Structure 1
């Protein structure tokens, strides 16, 4: 597997968490719960080189 670094990059608040899965779609699907619960809903963009997945709002 690979560890995806979730970075909440919002217009009011931010967050930083980490979760590993077989693919990007699982990282996104799972973290969306927390993202919207925390108050961030934006553009989900991934970088496999850095293993980062930023939600920019």
Structure 2
């Protein structure tokens, strides 16, 4: 049950993407760097209940 829709928080920036990783920790470095690559800094948010990762600025 790896997530399939990575939802980025953006006011005028919207999209989704999907990739594979070796494990959750390995995916963390990529996902956080991808938020940084968008000019988004903030705490990482996750809901196991829905299997989604959101960046709370």
Q: 1:9 to 1:35 in 2, by over 3 A?
A: same
Secondary structure of the corresponding residue to residue 15 of structure 1: coil
Q: As a proportion of its length, which structure holds more strand?
A: 1
Secondary structure of the corresponding residue to residue 18 of structure 1: coil
Counterparts of 2:49 and 2:22 in 1: how far apart (Å)? 15
What displacement does 1:29 show?
1.3
Give me the TM-score of the superposition, normalised by structure 2: 0.62
Q: 1:54 to 1:38 in 2, by over 3 A?
A: same
CA-atom RMSD in angstroms: 2.6
Give me the TM-score of the superposition, normalised by structure 1: 0.62
What displacement does 1:13 show?
4.2
Higher RCO, 1 or 2 (CA under 8 Å, sep at least 6)? 1
Identify unmatched segments of 5+ residues in structure 1.
none
